[PDB]
């Protein structure tokens, strides 16, 4: 048996490599980005946005974020999904973004995911898996985003219920807002300190 | 064969979040312990990227940004295999890399080091591993560079890499170094890794038989991701 | 002989309060240093428990909760001596123990592990040491068990024990393990102890000459408490 | 010379063994508990109660607490007490309790202790020695409870005065309350953080 | 590929028939040397057992005899590979196992040890290896047990196993033990094996990455049978 | 190259595992046993029986025995048989039995095997391969059973002739008996001592 | 304290019955294994011998048979302690010794060696150990002597001894040798003992501080017998 | 813990030291011998005699034998006897003898012992414990002598029943004979070979 290759920080330039187009480097014809909605993608369009704060409350303007999620019916666009249901064929389920260098704001355009089966016949509430990389972060930090308008489902979510501090569970719930007809979920991430966001070892 | 969960990440084989010798980590590391969860379909699935979308020079950092001529620096090929912890090849995984040029300078807005920019070098590439977990790319060896941690800190030459493979739980970003670089012994970032054997797991080895005469040198570097266990009794994933 | 204070506790021989690899300690350890005080009668005295109140099977975990039959598992006797750091026997000290059953399951409300409960096993016992500091009890060897620290964490087989002796300053709770258990090497709780020699001080040794033919095995395990110094000049305790 | 056996946490089930009767395990005829008052015990009856909080402010519902104290005249029921005074014969001076699984509240029924001699002819203010064990606590934590109505004695207490931060001394003083004729002292323990309780190496 | 005979059994890698420290062998071992023969079709053939006849729980000793509940004891998975001496996998071989329960008690008429019987445990299982020579079964870890050789003799925990494979000459019955069991060092049965390296070949190793969180531990144990040589010149078998 | 896994005795309970049904353990629906004759099996039915004796002449009541043999035409029901002849399709060729706990008697119901080719164009006399396991036997003991009514074939058998002591050859010949129409071959095995049975390293 | 059985005799610490290099053992050793039994009152009891019956010179082999003068040879005192395996003294045990004279000649009918007989030497003595397990006797150092095993076999100098103590199971006869005797390395009788550490357990050590000036040398030699275990649960002896 | 001192043969002169008077060495006033009957000893007088044979059937003329036994009521004259019954005060329970140099015959004059409790409430049949030392015997050989006229008790004896070979049990039974009014039990010991006497590890 082999040991996993050790993690190292992404460092301050984690976008030359992961988002070149926005470091103004035109090397690729097809570029990966933060838009998971294609024209025929099924489901309700939502915008996910927020900022990432260090231990003094300053937003990180060098952070790289990715999300991974199921389609509108709760099926993952992955060969490893074993539900035996057909996934939306016009949905990658993944995206990547950086924070705006000035403001620190990050965002994704995606669809609200459907509920996914949990272990042993349980059902998970709708969620998006999120990972954060940045200078100073030695290993990518994993967290999840749940939705405040799914309070009934959240109350029965296996993962949320496995957090014994009911006050920390709330750091994982994004707030629904409605900016000019568009549905927006605001999810701020506090890496360290008061109201520190829950991070998982998955 | 019915697959179960990925084996638990062995935290003693990785850097801790808080590592005071790497100053930036002091305010960017959680104070609370990570919450371990039992895996669900969310953690064992991951996206698929099609080969069709990749261009012909995506893995050739020597030519993919060359405009008027070739970039200046040491021509090197880097290759190796990506496998999981139980030794199985990781097929069609997305490998992305990025790095400084021969001067130790990044083509990034925020890099103001005096090492010279190279108009024919971009510094990023990507590839998918093949059915044997093999990958290969060509580049210019990066120069070491100064950064402010203590005032005279210098990173050894290194290439940053990222892997998206079969399960979200395998998601990994790290950096590899070049055999014999004397800065490897003094770097506070590499020293966040607790054990000497794991620090050596990030050093790419000179592969002399694979050098190409009058053309390029070659380094060998393998990567190991977490592996999934097989289930033979109850399958509790769902 | 006029007694003075107990010798200072050697903090380097014990786990620190904050031990990040044992996740629950992160929020249950003081941020401030402990305040050391010079001892008074409060710290050098302790209660006395009379032998009269103990029942005949209090130290026999095999029979003290047996209802319809015997508990299932490995019959073992554990014995040894309790002394202070200067080697003197600790007489009439109260020793209490508790543990899981052969499946690694505790008869506790909050234990929902799938290892089976044993209707004839309770899991707790107590005894007073004799005039030579000797103690002996019989039990079922406990099974190792899973717990959530990292997701696949497993405690080696162990018996929890507690001692109330002559001085409140001697108050101690700890756990002992069984020679050869391979989980001993991976446990984050045992690894909170800094030195290898102190981790070995918690391993009970196979005592083959003391096995009872066609009946039970035996383990030897000695315990050392803090000892008092004698005063020959000024007695400042009072 | 030998080294002290190393401490290890009591773990989450520290009551199967130390308070079986309340884990519903009937193995012993005589069970140790939190009532130090016997019918002929001398002195004023008091109830000592409180909760133990972790670093996020959540009460520990798995904690085990013991107290050790002198009788009404400040004499310990121990062979090691050298005052040469007779101790109350109907007083053990020790008790043990757990926190209520639901609320986190713990309590003891005991008597207010008399003043005990300090070192070199000094006099200590009335106090109860207390120790806490729980999952996550690697070594039992020692502290003391003094009484807010003994302000004159507290002001001259050697141990309290040896704490240089006068703001931390107050964490050791319990508050007197009078619930339906009964005297109650409320003593909350904060293991970590703001107003963290003083713990001693004794 | 035309097959020839199995390689000669290396008698120095096995216990001798007469081993006085194992008392029962004194009257059950031949006085004459074994007569070695050259192999014929009789020795190179063996029966075939169809997978169709095996039930779903035949390799699950935890559930195959459970009536009202689960057996008490340590939940463990044992797996590994069966290959021949030249390293080839042994496919579709019949593996049968039997063992005591967690108390060290056999569900056999003649076992009168006081260790308690478990009404939900039977103690026997079987499986066929797959095309890679792989096998897997689940059980309760057996307890060590006393027997009369010298009066206080104790067998380490062990599982008895039997293999019927491709050739009658490969027929083998043996027993495996668990890493770290201190009784391994004192057992007269294990000591009938002359060399230390062969005694270690019977010890199943802790396989921590393959443990199943909050469920079962796992041990890895491989088995090597005699292998056949290929014939390239005269084929004298017939 | 690897070394063969070392043999160890089967021990006194070699039937919990190998003949559970007769240790009264009902775990398997299909159980292996000592009856090799199925209704359409070809050949003459014979019963093979005997006892196994230790060095003092006491029968072993804990012994496990298996036999392996060819069909009526001398073909093995094994993929490794290279005669290119078709084997009887209703014949496993193998069986297993234990000795009766009281008497020590063991038996099998099978068919008399046909002659099998020997090495280099020779022909072996009809035989059954037999192996014995028991407490005290560190490695299974291999022997063969030939038939006393095949004296002409036995005289030319390569294996029997390779035993230089003509007095030991006779220990391998079972005696034909005819109990109520049934043909029975009695084969007693003496592990040690006078008239010790020949055992082979195969 | 309620006593249980003596600990099992460890057969690997003693010579085997059949030891072909010691020729006389070939026809005087059982072919069958010894039958181990669980102890009863028969095995844990033994006779008591009163000090009253011993004469004043019973432990003085120099004077107890002297008639006209002193025996010729090296005056030596031998002393030491008899304890059981758990270290407890063996009190009032009967120790008997016998030996050849300074020439290596026994005062026995059947001894026809040419080494000269000594009219003032008898060669036998006895004593009871005291409350500390101590014994002391004085004698003439015996000479080595020839015997017929191979034709030129020679026993190192030795004193035969016998102990009857508290339990019949402790009954022991053996022989001790003198530090530095070069014949110790070649004796087939001493070589029947399997381990080197046990052969050294029979060598009496020079005790120079205890020599008596202008009188006698002294050798120290301790003896260990089997020890009894204490019973704390069921007492099955009766 | 210490290891037992290793045994060594008594050698050919085991009587200079253990029976000097009969090697004609007068060193002791009081000599130990083979007569366990004192004038007031209670019980029936019996003579125990026999010979010890090597593997070729030759008697050993250099053997030393001791016996250990209970009194007429089955009580041992030992402080370690816990029956709480009073032992015959005129009985040592032990004796020692050598074989006659010419004939090889050995004998003891003693009393027939009463039945002694066995383990767990069982009762042992009447027996005498016997040990043999001689040149060639590396460790003293332990055996027991039972009596043929106690067949009912012998049938229920725990130790005899623990010998699985019923043919070997008989080697432990001495035969009663009546020479001129005296009761004699003949017990021959065969160290090796046919009808080898059972020896125990006790
Ligand atoms: Fe970099
Ligand atoms: Fe525990
Ligand atoms: Fe077994
Ligand atoms: Fe001698």
């Amino acid at each position: 048996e082999l040991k996993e290759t050790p993690s190292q920080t992404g460092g301050p330039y984690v976008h030359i490599g992961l988002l070149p187009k926005q470091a103004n480097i035109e090397v690729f014809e097809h570029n990966l980005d933060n838009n998971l909605v294609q024209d025929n993608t099924q489901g309700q369009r939502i915008r996910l946005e927020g900022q990432v704060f260090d231990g003094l409350g300053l937003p990180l303007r060098d952070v790289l974020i990715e999300i991974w999620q199921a389609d509108t019916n709760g099926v993952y666009p992955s060969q490893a999904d074993t539900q035996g249901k057909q996934v939306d064929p016009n949905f990658l389920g993944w995206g990547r973004t950086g924070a705006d260098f000035g403001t620190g704001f990050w965002s994704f355009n995606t669809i609200k995911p459907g509920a996914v089966p949990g272990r042993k016949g349980s059902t998970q509430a709708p969620h998006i898996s999120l990972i954060i990389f940045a200078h100073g972060i030695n290993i990518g930090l994993h967290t999840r985003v749940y939705f405040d308008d799914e309070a009934e489902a959240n109350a029965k979510d296996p993962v949320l219920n496995s957090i014994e501090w009911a006050t920390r569970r709330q750091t994982l719930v994004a707030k629904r807002e409605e900016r000019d007809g568009e549905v927006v979920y605001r999810f701020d991430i506090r890496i360290q300190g008061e109201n520190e966001t829950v991070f998982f070892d998955i | 064969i019915i697959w179960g969960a990925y084996a638990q990440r062995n935290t003693e084989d990785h850097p801790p979040a808080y590592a005071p010798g790497y100053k930036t980590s002091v305010l960017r590391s959680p104070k609370n312990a990570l919450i371990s969860i039992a895996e669900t379909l969310s953690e064992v699935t991951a996206p698929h990227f099609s080969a069709d979308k990749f261009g012909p020079k995506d893995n050739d950092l020597i030519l993919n940004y060359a405009k008027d001529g070739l970039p200046i620096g040491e021509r090197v090929i880097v290759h190796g295999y990506v496998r999981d912890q139980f030794g199985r090849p990781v097929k069609n995984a997305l490998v992305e890399v990025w790095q400084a040029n021969a001067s130790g300078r990044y083509r990034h807005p925020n890099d103001q080091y005096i090492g010279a920019m190279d108009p024919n070098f971009g510094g990023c590439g990507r590839m998918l591993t093949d059915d044997n977990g093999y990958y290969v790319f060509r580049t210019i060896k990066p120069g070491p560079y100064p950064w402010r941690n203590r005032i005279n800190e210098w990173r050894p030459a290194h290439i940053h890499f990222s892997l998206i493979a079969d399960g979200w739980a395998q998601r990994l970003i790290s950096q590899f170094y070049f055999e014999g670089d004397t800065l490897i012994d003094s770097c506070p970032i590499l020293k966040t890794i607790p054990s000497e054997q794991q620090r050596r797991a990030l050093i790419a080895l000179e592969d002399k038989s694979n050098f190409i005469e009058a053309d390029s040198r070659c380094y060998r570097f393998d990567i190991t991701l977490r592996g999934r266990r097989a289930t033979y009794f109850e399958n509790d994933l769902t």
Side-chain angles (χ1 to χ4, degrees), chain A, chain B:
Chain A
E1 189 177 340
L2 303 166
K3 291 180 171 296
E4 187 178 12
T5 289
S7 180
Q8 294 274 75
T9 179
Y13 310 128
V14 65
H15 357 73
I16 278 157
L18 270 20
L19 287 179
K21 232 199 200 256
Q22 329 204 164
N24 323 144
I25 303 171
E26 261 85 282
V27 280
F28 304 140
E29 204 188 12
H30 297 294
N31 296 279
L32 310 172
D33 66 24
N34 66 333
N35 186 196
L36 287 65
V37 188
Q38 298 164 42
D39 42 294
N40 288 52
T41 304
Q42 292 162 56
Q44 80 165 141
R45 277 76 175 136
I46 57 161
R47 169 180 198 66
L48 177 59
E49 64 181 47
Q51 291 173 291
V52 181
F53 300 100
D54 66 13
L56 287 184
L58 187 70
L60 278 63
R61 293 164 293 182
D62 57 356
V63 68
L64 185 104
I65 299 297
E66 294 177 3
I67 54 168
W68 170 236
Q69 63 165 279
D71 69 5
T72 198
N73 295 315
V75 180
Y76 283 101
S78 170
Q79 299 193 312
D81 183 298
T82 59
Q83 305 185 64
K85 296 183 182 180
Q86 175 177 54
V87 69
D88 173 342
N90 297 297
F91 191 58
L92 185 63
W94 173 95
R96 174 185 291 162
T97 203
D100 171 65
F101 283 151
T103 70
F105 264 83
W106 52 268
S107 65
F108 289 91
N109 297 310
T110 183
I111 58 156
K112 191 182 182 176
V116 176
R119 295 170 68 87
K120 309 179 184 193
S122 63
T123 303
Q124 308 188 76
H127 60 273
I128 292 168
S129 289
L130 188 156
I131 189 168
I132 302 147
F133 307 102
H135 180 39
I137 293 183
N138 294 322
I139 313 179
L141 287 172
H142 294 278
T143 189
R144 284 180 166 196
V145 186
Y146 289 80
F147 306 98
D148 70 346
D149 58 314
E150 294 287 349
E152 184 82 295
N154 291 345
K156 305 162 199 187
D157 184 75
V159 170
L160 283 179
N161 286 313
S162 77
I163 297 162
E164 33 181 321
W165 301 274
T167 169
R168 295 205 73 202
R169 288 169 202 173
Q170 63 182 266
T171 63
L172 298 183
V173 184
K175 292 177 173 190
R176 189 187 177 98
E177 234 177 82
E178 287 172 52
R179 300 289 173 185
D180 323 317
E182 278 190 60
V183 174
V184 177
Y185 283 98
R186 165 57 96 84
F187 184 64
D188 287 335
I189 292 160
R190 287 175 185 85
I191 297 165
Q192 173 185 99
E194 264 185 68
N195 295 321
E196 180 181 293
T197 306
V198 167
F199 291 113
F200 298 114
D201 189 335
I202 65 166
Chain B
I1 316 171
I2 306 169
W3 297 105
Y6 282 83
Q8 169 188 281
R9 167 159 281 171
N10 186 161
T11 60
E12 301 156 73
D13 286 342
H14 289 279
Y18 178 71
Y22 175 17
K23 298 172 180 195
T24 303
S25 80
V26 176
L27 290 164
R28 298 180 177 197
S29 53
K31 186 207 72 197
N32 287 288
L34 299 182
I35 301 185
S36 294
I37 62 157
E39 294 186 339
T40 70
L41 284 182
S42 295
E43 295 65 45
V44 307
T45 54
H48 295 273
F49 297 98
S50 50
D52 284 323
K53 303 170 181 178
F54 291 74
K57 289 189 295 201
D58 289 7
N59 65 331
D60 183 352
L61 287 71
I62 296 187
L63 301 183
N64 70 10
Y65 204 78
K67 312 302 185 161
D68 321 309
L70 293 181
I72 287 156
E74 298 170 36
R75 296 169 61 90
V76 304
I77 292 162
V78 176
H79 65 154
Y81 298 85
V82 181
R83 46 192 80 87
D84 67 23
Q85 78 197 85
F86 301 116
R88 310 165 189 132
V90 175
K91 311 164 174 172
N92 306 308
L94 176 57
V95 187
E96 296 166 285
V97 299
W98 68 100
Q99 58 170 91
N101 69 188
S103 305
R105 179 72 176 291
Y106 285 93
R107 173 180 283 290
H108 198 273
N110 304 177
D111 189 355
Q112 301 278 62
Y113 175 47
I114 183 180
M117 276 294 302
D118 185 332
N120 290 125
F121 193 71
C124 63
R126 60 186 184 189
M127 328 116 250
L128 291 168
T129 59
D130 71 14
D131 303 307
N132 293 314
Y134 185 66
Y135 72 89
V136 60
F137 72 96
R138 170 167 88 165
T139 190
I140 286 299
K141 178 171 184 164
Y145 59 82
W147 60 300
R148 186 161 66 138
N149 180 60
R150 289 171 290 190
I151 201 63
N152 212 346
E153 215 74 76
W154 288 73
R155 290 313 310 296
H158 59 286
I159 291 178
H160 293 273
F161 66 94
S162 167
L163 280 93
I164 299 178
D166 296 285
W168 195 236
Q170 299 175 118
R171 189 76 183 84
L172 180 72
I173 283 185
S174 184
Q175 308 177 204
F176 69 80
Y177 306 92
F178 296 89
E179 200 181 350
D181 186 326
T182 50
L183 288 170
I184 287 171
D185 294 308
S186 294
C187 182
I189 293 178
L190 182 57
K191 284 194 242 195
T192 62
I193 294 172
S195 79
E196 182 68 8
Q197 74 178 77
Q198 282 289 88
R199 294 171 187 174
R200 283 181 293 198
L202 296 178
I203 302 180
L205 300 179
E206 180 182 86
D207 190 359
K208 198 156 168 65
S209 293
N210 282 308
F211 284 12
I212 302 180
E213 58 281 357
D215 186 332
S216 303
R217 282 158 40 240
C218 180
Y219 278 90
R220 171 69 185 276
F221 183 60
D222 292 351
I223 298 167
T224 304
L225 299 184
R226 290 165 67 186
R228 273 183 102 174
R229 306 180 303 237
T231 290
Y232 287 100
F233 299 94
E234 298 89 6
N235 180 48
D236 285 339
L237 210 46
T238 268

